[PDB]
Design an enzyme around this catalytic site. Structure first.
Site, mmCIF file in Angstrom:
data_model
loop_
_atom_site.group_PDB
_atom_site.id
_atom_site.type_symbol
_atom_site.label_atom_id
_atom_site.label_comp_id
_atom_site.label_asym_id
_atom_site.label_seq_id
_atom_site.Cartn_x
_atom_site.Cartn_y
_atom_site.Cartn_z
ATOM 1 N N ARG A 176 0.842 -1.203 0.000
ATOM 2 C CA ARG A 176 0.000 0.000 0.000
ATOM 3 C C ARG A 176 0.883 1.262 0.000
ATOM 4 O O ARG A 176 0.962 1.975 0.998
ATOM 5 C CB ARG A 176 -0.952 -0.009 1.206
ATOM 6 C CG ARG A 176 -2.030 -1.113 1.143
ATOM 7 C CD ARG A 176 -2.859 -1.266 2.438
ATOM 8 N NE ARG A 176 -1.982 -1.358 3.592
ATOM 9 C CZ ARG A 176 -1.436 -2.484 4.039
ATOM 10 N NH1 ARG A 176 -1.746 -3.651 3.481
ATOM 11 N NH2 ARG A 176 -0.604 -2.433 5.069
ATOM 12 N N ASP A 241 2.451 -8.326 6.926
ATOM 13 C CA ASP A 241 1.359 -7.625 6.265
ATOM 14 C C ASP A 241 0.240 -8.485 5.678
ATOM 15 O O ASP A 241 -0.345 -8.110 4.667
ATOM 16 C CB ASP A 241 1.898 -6.666 5.188
ATOM 17 C CG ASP A 241 0.876 -5.613 4.795
ATOM 18 O OD1 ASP A 241 0.188 -5.098 5.704
ATOM 19 O OD2 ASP A 241 0.725 -5.325 3.589
ATOM 20 N N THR A 242 -0.083 -9.607 6.313
ATOM 21 C CA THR A 242 -1.187 -10.434 5.812
ATOM 22 C C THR A 242 -2.191 -10.677 6.932
ATOM 23 O O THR A 242 -3.255 -10.033 6.973
ATOM 24 C CB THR A 242 -0.700 -11.795 5.224
ATOM 25 O OG1 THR A 242 0.000 -12.516 6.232
ATOM 26 C CG2 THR A 242 0.228 -11.626 4.008
ATOM 27 N N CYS A 347 -0.139 -20.252 -1.204
ATOM 28 C CA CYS A 347 0.470 -19.678 0.004
ATOM 29 C C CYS A 347 1.194 -20.717 0.837
ATOM 30 O O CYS A 347 0.607 -21.745 1.184
ATOM 31 C CB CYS A 347 -0.608 -19.010 0.885
ATOM 32 S SG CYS A 347 0.033 -18.316 2.422
ATOM 33 N N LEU A 348 2.451 -20.442 1.174
ATOM 34 C CA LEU A 348 3.223 -21.319 2.081
ATOM 35 C C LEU A 348 2.965 -21.016 3.554
ATOM 36 O O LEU A 348 3.180 -21.867 4.418
ATOM 37 C CB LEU A 348 4.723 -21.191 1.808
ATOM 38 C CG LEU A 348 5.186 -21.689 0.440
ATOM 39 C CD1 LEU A 348 6.593 -21.235 0.155
ATOM 40 C CD2 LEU A 348 5.085 -23.209 0.329
ATOM 41 N N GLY A 349 2.485 -19.810 3.826
ATOM 42 C CA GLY A 349 2.309 -19.345 5.187
ATOM 43 C C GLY A 349 0.922 -19.594 5.750
ATOM 44 O O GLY A 349 0.625 -19.148 6.851
HETATM 45 C C1 HEM Z 1 -4.238 -14.162 5.923
HETATM 46 C C2 HEM Z 1 -2.973 -14.503 5.713
HETATM 47 C C3 HEM Z 1 -2.366 -14.768 4.306
HETATM 48 C C4 HEM Z 1 -2.894 -14.588 3.081
HETATM 49 C C5 HEM Z 1 -4.296 -14.052 2.721
HETATM 50 C C6 HEM Z 1 -1.922 -14.990 2.097
HETATM 51 C C7 HEM Z 1 -2.092 -14.975 0.725
HETATM 52 C C8 HEM Z 1 -1.232 -15.463 -0.252
HETATM 53 C C9 HEM Z 1 -1.486 -15.499 -1.674
HETATM 54 C C10 HEM Z 1 -2.755 -14.987 -2.402
HETATM 55 C C11 HEM Z 1 -0.416 -16.022 -2.274
HETATM 56 C C12 HEM Z 1 -0.250 -16.238 -3.795
HETATM 57 C C13 HEM Z 1 0.524 -15.086 -4.439
HETATM 58 C C14 HEM Z 1 0.796 -15.295 -5.911
HETATM 59 O O1 HEM Z 1 0.448 -16.367 -6.448
HETATM 60 O O2 HEM Z 1 1.370 -14.400 -6.591
HETATM 61 C C15 HEM Z 1 0.558 -16.341 -1.237
HETATM 62 C C16 HEM Z 1 1.805 -16.909 -1.396
HETATM 63 C C17 HEM Z 1 2.824 -16.908 -0.439
HETATM 64 N N1 HEM Z 1 2.670 -16.650 0.918
HETATM 65 FE FE1 HEM Z 1 0.904 -16.140 1.855
HETATM 66 N N2 HEM Z 1 -0.807 -15.444 2.783
HETATM 67 C C18 HEM Z 1 -1.032 -15.292 4.136
HETATM 68 C C19 HEM Z 1 -0.141 -15.615 5.131
HETATM 69 C C20 HEM Z 1 1.221 -15.813 4.917
HETATM 70 C C21 HEM Z 1 2.262 -15.770 5.913
HETATM 71 C C22 HEM Z 1 2.004 -15.490 7.405
HETATM 72 C C23 HEM Z 1 3.436 -15.986 5.298
HETATM 73 C C24 HEM Z 1 4.837 -16.054 5.912
HETATM 74 C C25 HEM Z 1 4.984 -16.669 7.090
HETATM 75 C C26 HEM Z 1 3.171 -16.194 3.900
HETATM 76 C C27 HEM Z 1 4.115 -16.477 2.937
HETATM 77 C C28 HEM Z 1 3.888 -16.686 1.590
HETATM 78 C C29 HEM Z 1 4.923 -17.072 0.668
HETATM 79 C C30 HEM Z 1 6.407 -17.276 1.050
HETATM 80 C C31 HEM Z 1 4.215 -17.215 -0.683
HETATM 81 C C32 HEM Z 1 4.812 -17.598 -2.046
HETATM 82 C C33 HEM Z 1 4.599 -19.099 -2.308
HETATM 83 C C34 HEM Z 1 5.257 -19.400 -3.623
HETATM 84 O O3 HEM Z 1 5.543 -18.444 -4.377
HETATM 85 O O4 HEM Z 1 5.494 -20.588 -3.962
HETATM 86 N N3 HEM Z 1 1.814 -16.105 3.709
HETATM 87 N N4 HEM Z 1 0.015 -16.017 -0.022
HETATM 88 C C1 LIG Z 2 0.780 -11.391 -2.495
HETATM 89 C C2 LIG Z 2 1.418 -11.849 -1.182
HETATM 90 C C3 LIG Z 2 0.411 -11.830 -0.032
HETATM 91 C C4 LIG Z 2 2.130 -13.188 -1.347
HETATM 92 C C5 LIG Z 2 2.975 -13.280 -0.067
HETATM 93 C C6 LIG Z 2 3.271 -11.828 0.323
HETATM 94 C C7 LIG Z 2 2.674 -11.065 -0.858
HETATM 95 C C8 LIG Z 2 2.507 -9.567 -0.654
HETATM 96 C C9 LIG Z 2 3.507 -11.479 -2.053
HETATM 97 O O1 LIG Z 2 4.480 -10.690 -2.705
HETATM 98 C C10 LIG Z 2 3.153 -12.892 -2.452
#
Ligand code: HEM
Ligand SMILES: CC1(C)[C@@H]2CC[C@@]1(C)C(=O)C2
Ligand SMILES: *SCC1=CC(C)(C)N(O)C1(C)C
Ligand SMILES: *SCC1=CC(C)(C)N(O)C1(C)C
Ligand SMILES: [K+]
Length: 403
Positions: A176, A241-242, A347-349
């Protein structure tokens, strides 16, 4: 507004601004949902933000996230400058190159890690909530939604709490932008922070997530410093930031809906299903892809290098996926969404996220069952790659709480 490219038909134009949507006063999900009213085509071109495609329906969003050959994740952020500079790992890599890096990341955030971290999550949640409980009010965004997930992350990453203000600032600029920094500048400053830390933990590894990532194996060899940096940086963005934003949308909802609160108070075992429904209704992420070639997609002519926003937020809001999408139904038989993405970059997180969300709701509803929005507060939302809540003042009667 950028001049309409010749290959885009006029009837496909709908000038939605993902960073400043027209109907934002109605709620950010509501603002984005204008894209799904009947006068809007399945795939539109907005002239905002340099100009780009937006898929407005689950079907297209899912299809595009599946077809990485046409829709590459190499440039996944709008505007173009941001997608160009975006180089986080694994997200900026197409299959199969990303798999090895996902495996490594799973060693620091995968289900097994989350299960071993559950005790600290519960501990921190309980501690913060109990500190808040006899006060009868809080500023939810800064008193809980931020420090809770962020301190768990900093603990996992073995980074100092005193660094939170600098890092949270930087991560928010990427999602943002307030105008002070381009995405490239925000990214380079986050890299500036991480580089020496990564070098020190490659020299003298600790047991923290950064030490693990910076010393892991990918592709039959040690990870490089540069790869480590690009992966740790994305993990920081995820951690800061999620869930931080999502908890505020959920708690805002629950503050405003005594009947939904009562459901979870009366039947606490429902909290996981309820959490998933909240994940659908208050979905908050919107990134996308870039066209690798000229491609006709659902009768629309796309050109090589066109960007396409594929808002993960919209899939579960699509009445084609869920009847009465804007209404929260904890009993909803099939909660369809792509809140956590779709395809090769799922998402990995998300396991860490769910645990944080479910721990928060269960502990809050146990200690502070009855609470409301503070008198005459109007809750304002904000939009971007990840959407958020500006402020969430909450009040309650301390005599109704349990210590
Ligand atoms: C409400 C919580 C969360 C939401 C809504 C969310 C959402 C997402 C989404 C939509 C993507 C796909 C992005 C894309 O395809 O370009 C993604 C990927 C990813 N997220 Fe999350 N996430 C959350 C929590 C987290 C947390 C807490 C972490 C770290 C601890 C995390 C780490 C990542 C990573 C490392 C990826 C990339 C996976 C890859 O590229 O193979 N996420 N997430
Ligand atoms: C779109 C996301 C939520 C996902 C993990 C963090 C984020 C901002 C990315 O750049 C990939
Ligand atoms: S069918 C939804 C709809 C679209 C538009 C043509 C803008 N409208 O006036 C309504 C609200 C009928
Ligand atoms: S907009 C004020 C500002 C600009 C920049 C050089 C990126 N900064 O570090 C701050 C946030 C002070
Ligand atoms: K890029």
């Amino acid at each position: 507004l950028a001049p309409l490219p010749p290959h885009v038909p006029e009837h496909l134009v709908f000038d939605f601004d993902m960073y400043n949507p027209s109907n934002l006063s109605a709620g950010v999900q509501e603002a984005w949902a204008v894209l799904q009213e009947c006068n809007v085509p399945d795939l539109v071109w907005t002239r905002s933000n340099g100009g780009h495609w937006i898929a407005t329906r689950g079907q297209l969003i899912r299809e595009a996230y599946e077809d990485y050959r046409h829709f590459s994740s190499e440039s996944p952020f709008i505007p173009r400058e941001a997608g160009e500079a975006y180089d986080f790992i694994p997200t900026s890599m197409d299959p199969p190159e990303q798999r090895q890096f996902r495996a490594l990341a799973n060693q620091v955030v995968g289900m097994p890690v989350v299960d071993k971290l559950e005790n600290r999550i519960q501990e921190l949640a309980s501690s913060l909530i109990e500190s808040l409980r006899p006060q009868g009010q809080c500023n939810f965004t800064e008193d809980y939604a931020e420090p809770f997930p962020i301190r768990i992350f900093m603990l996992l990453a073995g980074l100092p709490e005193e660094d939170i203000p600098h890092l949270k600032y930087l991560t928010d600029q990427m999602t943002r932008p307030d105008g002070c920094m381009t995405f490239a500048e925000a990214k380079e400053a986050l890299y500036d922070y991480l580089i020496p830390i990564i070098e020190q933990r490659r020299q003298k590894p600790g047991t923290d997530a950064i030490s693990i990532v910076a010393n892991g194996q990918v592709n039959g060899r040690p990870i490089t410093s540069d790869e480590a940096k690009r992966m740790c940086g994305l993990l920081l963005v995820g951690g800061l930031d999620t869930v931080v934003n999502f908890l505020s949308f959920s708690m805002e909802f629950l503050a405003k809906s005594p009947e939904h609160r009562q459901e979870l108070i009366e039947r606490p075992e429902r909290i996981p299903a309820a959490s998933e429904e909240l994940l659908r209704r208050f979905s908050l992420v919107a990134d996308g892809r870039i066209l690798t070639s000229d491609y006709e997609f659902h009768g629309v002519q796309l050109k090589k290098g066109d960007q396409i926003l594929l808002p993960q937020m919209l899939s579960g809001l699509d009445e084609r996926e869920n009847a009465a999408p804007m209404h929260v139904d904890f009993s909803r038989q099939k909660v369809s969404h792509t809140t956590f993405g779709h395809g090769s970059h799922l998402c990995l997180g998300q396991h860490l996220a769910r645990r944080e969300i479910i721990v928060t709701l269960k502990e809050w509803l146990t200690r502070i069952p009855d609470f409301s929005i503070a008198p005459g507060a109007q809750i304002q939302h904000k939009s971007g790659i990840v959407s958020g809540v500006q402020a969430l003042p909450l009040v309650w009667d301390p005599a109704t709480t349990k210590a």
